Design an enzyme around this catalytic site. Structure first.
Site, mmCIF file in Angstrom:
data_model
loop_
_atom_site.group_PDB
_atom_site.id
_atom_site.type_symbol
_atom_site.label_atom_id
_atom_site.label_comp_id
_atom_site.label_asym_id
_atom_site.label_seq_id
_atom_site.Cartn_x
_atom_site.Cartn_y
_atom_site.Cartn_z
ATOM 1 C CG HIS B 41 1.834 14.760 52.614
ATOM 2 N ND1 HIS B 41 2.034 15.906 53.365
ATOM 3 C CD2 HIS B 41 3.019 14.375 52.082
ATOM 4 C CE1 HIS B 41 3.314 16.212 53.213
ATOM 5 N NE2 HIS B 41 3.955 15.312 52.466
ATOM 6 N N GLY B 143 7.844 22.220 56.902
ATOM 7 C CA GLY B 143 7.487 23.174 55.850
ATOM 8 C C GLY B 143 8.275 23.019 54.547
ATOM 9 C CB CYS B 145 6.472 18.714 52.510
ATOM 10 S SG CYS B 145 6.861 17.657 53.924
HETATM 11 C C1 LIG Z 1 12.648 19.658 63.933
HETATM 12 S S1 LIG Z 1 12.578 18.782 62.418
HETATM 13 O O1 LIG Z 1 13.056 17.453 62.644
HETATM 14 O O2 LIG Z 1 13.205 19.578 61.408
HETATM 15 N N1 LIG Z 1 10.999 18.615 62.050
HETATM 16 C C2 LIG Z 1 10.422 18.191 60.808
HETATM 17 C C3 LIG Z 1 9.043 18.011 60.760
HETATM 18 C C4 LIG Z 1 8.434 17.488 59.661
HETATM 19 C C5 LIG Z 1 9.175 17.167 58.500
HETATM 20 C C6 LIG Z 1 8.595 16.602 57.317
HETATM 21 N N2 LIG Z 1 7.264 16.109 57.381
HETATM 22 C C7 LIG Z 1 6.856 14.811 57.419
HETATM 23 O O3 LIG Z 1 7.637 13.862 57.359
HETATM 24 C C8 LIG Z 1 5.348 14.604 57.595
HETATM 25 C C9 LIG Z 1 5.007 14.749 59.079
HETATM 26 N N3 LIG Z 1 5.695 13.623 59.739
HETATM 27 S S2 LIG Z 1 6.587 13.817 61.082
HETATM 28 O O4 LIG Z 1 6.396 12.655 61.890
HETATM 29 O O5 LIG Z 1 6.261 15.101 61.619
HETATM 30 C C10 LIG Z 1 8.289 13.843 60.553
HETATM 31 C C11 LIG Z 1 9.330 13.652 61.650
HETATM 32 C C12 LIG Z 1 9.585 12.242 61.962
HETATM 33 N N4 LIG Z 1 9.811 11.145 62.163
HETATM 34 C C13 LIG Z 1 9.445 14.664 62.769
HETATM 35 C C14 LIG Z 1 10.520 14.579 61.753
HETATM 36 C C15 LIG Z 1 5.131 12.297 59.452
HETATM 37 C C16 LIG Z 1 4.911 12.135 57.965
HETATM 38 C C17 LIG Z 1 4.702 10.855 57.452
HETATM 39 C C18 LIG Z 1 4.527 10.650 56.096
HETATM 40 C C19 LIG Z 1 4.530 11.737 55.251
HETATM 41 CL CL1 LIG Z 1 4.396 11.477 53.534
HETATM 42 C C20 LIG Z 1 4.696 13.024 55.726
HETATM 43 C C21 LIG Z 1 4.926 13.233 57.088
HETATM 44 C C22 LIG Z 1 9.438 16.434 56.216
HETATM 45 N N5 LIG Z 1 10.748 16.723 56.190
HETATM 46 C C23 LIG Z 1 11.294 17.198 57.304
HETATM 47 C C24 LIG Z 1 10.576 17.437 58.503
HETATM 48 C C25 LIG Z 1 11.183 17.930 59.687
#
Ligand SMILES: CS(=O)(=O)Nc1ccc2c(NC(=O)[C@@H]3CN(S(=O)(=O)CC4(C#N)CC4)Cc4ccc(Cl)cc43)cncc2c1
Ligand SMILES: [Cl-]
EC number: 3.4.19.12
Lengths: 298, 305
Positions: B41, B143, B145
């Site tokens: 991704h 970040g 990932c």
């Molecule tokens: C403030 S926090 O909660 O620490 N923020 C994040 C942001 C992104 C994070 C992240 N990234 C993903 O998981 C990405 C982007 N996202 S997302 O919707 O931004 C993820 C969230 C939800 N629900 C907000 C938390 C969708 C998605 C779908 C599928 C695949 Cl393969 C990748 C992704 C990985 N690990 C921690 C993450 C912490």
């Protein structure tokens, strides 16, 4: 999201671990430049008298498969400094720092100069650490990492009869009223690190846990009268100042969070948990909470 | 003495962490020999995540579209291929710090260390377990990932996890190092929910044997149980079924302490019924399930207190 007891990456410290053998005793040493630092009890007591008889070749120092040759030796408090003929090429940028009770650090547990695990812990108010160490762990070190600099703060020396641990800073000064010999030694009654519990309650609110919040506030004096009854360390104005950024980020004043802690102390959790715990957690400092909810790298 | 949630020393893994950038997305990659492994991704926009056609996005990329940074050095990408949900970037320099390694797929209940990274820079290390619902309760920010999970056995690093996503519930999902997801998850932003999580029974039992080894027996009783009766009670508390394999695996801990597995199962049954009554076991007020039988044998002494 998520809240884990996180240790610093241990790589910079792994490249400093060596095995030190003197007679029948084998423990760990820290090789920084051309000096190996280790507990002075490796020679085991009049330590001047015991040391004066020893010659350089009595100390066997092993770094992986390579044998380092000892060319000098001196003592600084409860730490033995062995001058070796080779400088450690993997020597990181470092400082020796003395920490205060309540402050946290990572421990790289070692056996025979080989690192086996890393864990995070705090210096308790009674100066002991609740570590996990077996025989051969002596000389294992505690540290923090700030940018590229490793700050060494602890060297393991012994286990107390209650299962807790005691040691020195890297200048050989013990943390706590402990001495390095087999005698009647016991840890004083321990207390809870209040500023750390509050920081962990702020970490919980940041992660969506707010059931414990209330509309009430308190005075610092009234909070301390209640806290002193549950074996909690007194909360000072400095502690309040240090919690400032976490109070501004969540919109919950420190004395507002203190009123929540007071209600948790008098009523318990009622079958509920905070950050997956049924106990009030005190081994995360305000700085640790900020770092784990920010993304600081090394 | 003592019992801590211990992670493996992370040094061998720190020397493999790199930063991978494709367009506007920046995440972590694992540099082993001349290949950088990272979540596929990285080639997506947030819009692409709803219904990404990875093959269509990849065919439009050339080598120079991938920016790989190892410390201050920029690695040149000379090839690229996809294996399931991981992208494999061929680089022109082999990693001199490549440790001895294996890619292993773990099963639920197994533990591992995670080296959390941001911008190819490691920031912390923690221990965790693959939950029965295939998610992990990690601590990851934006970040992270591409951060990896591993175990170390002698000098060999066994990579078992690569972080791909956070679910709306805050739990984490990812793949093995061959790009196969753990659990029914997709690297797509679709309404996928983690199944109801359960307690890893074999791990709780192992942790009760660890308490007996460090000198605590207050929770033991004079009863035993059949495996079937234990499972009928355990299922009622959302505990995973205990199998004959789990009993066999607990054998060495049963022989070391002199407490039969079904005898320890009777204590667990009663602990679920009564709670702890203001008492703790190894400094915990909850029954801990993130230490395997192998972890307990590793951390706890061979001699019982
Ligand atoms: C403030 S926090 O909660 O620490 N923020 C994040 C942001 C992104 C994070 C992240 N990234 C993903 O998981 C990405 C982007 N996202 S997302 O919707 O931004 C993820 C969230 C939800 N629900 C907000 C938390 C969708 C998605 C779908 C599928 C695949 Cl393969 C990748 C992704 C990985 N690990 C921690 C993450 C912490
Ligand atoms: Cl497995």
């Amino acid at each position: 999201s998520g809240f884990r007891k996180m240790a610093f990456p241990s790589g910079k410290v792994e490249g400093c671990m060596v095995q030190v053998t003197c007679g029948t005793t084998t423990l760990n040493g820290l090789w920084l430049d051309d000096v190996v630092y280790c507990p002075r009890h490796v020679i085991c007591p009049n330590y001047e008298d015991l040391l004066i008889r020893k010659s350089n070749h009595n100390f066997l120092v092993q770094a992986g498969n390579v044998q380092l040759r000892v060319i000098g030796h001196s003592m600084q408090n409860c730490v033995l400094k062995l001058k070796v003929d080779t400088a450690n090429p993997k020597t990181p940028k470092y400082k020796f720092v003395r920490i205060q009770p309540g402050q946290t650090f990572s421990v790289l547990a070692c056996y025979n100069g080989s690192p086996s695990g890393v864990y995070q812990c705090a210096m308790r108010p009674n100066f002991t650490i609740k570590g996990s160490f077996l025989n051969g762990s002596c000389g294992s070190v505690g540290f923090n990492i700030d940018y590229d600099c490793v700050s060494f703060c602890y060297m393991h020396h012994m286990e107390l009869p209650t299962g807790v641990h005691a040691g020195t800073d890297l200048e050989g000064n013990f943390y706590g009223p402990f001495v390095d010999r087999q005698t009647a030694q016991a840890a004083g009654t321990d207390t809870t690190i209040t500023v750390n519990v509050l920081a962990w309650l702020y970490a919980a609110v940041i992660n969506g846990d707010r059931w414990f919040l209330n509309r009430f506030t308190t005075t610092l004096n009234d909070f301390n009268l209640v806290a002193m009854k549950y074996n909690y360390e007194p909360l000072t104005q400095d502690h309040v100042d240090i919690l400032g950024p976490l109070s501004a980020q969540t919109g919950i004043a420190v004395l507002d969070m203190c009123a929540s802690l007071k209600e948790l102390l008098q009523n318990g959790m009622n079958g509920r948990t905070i950050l997956g715990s049924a106990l009030l957690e005190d081994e995360f400092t305000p700085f640790d909470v900020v770092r784990q909810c920010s993304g600081v790298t090394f």
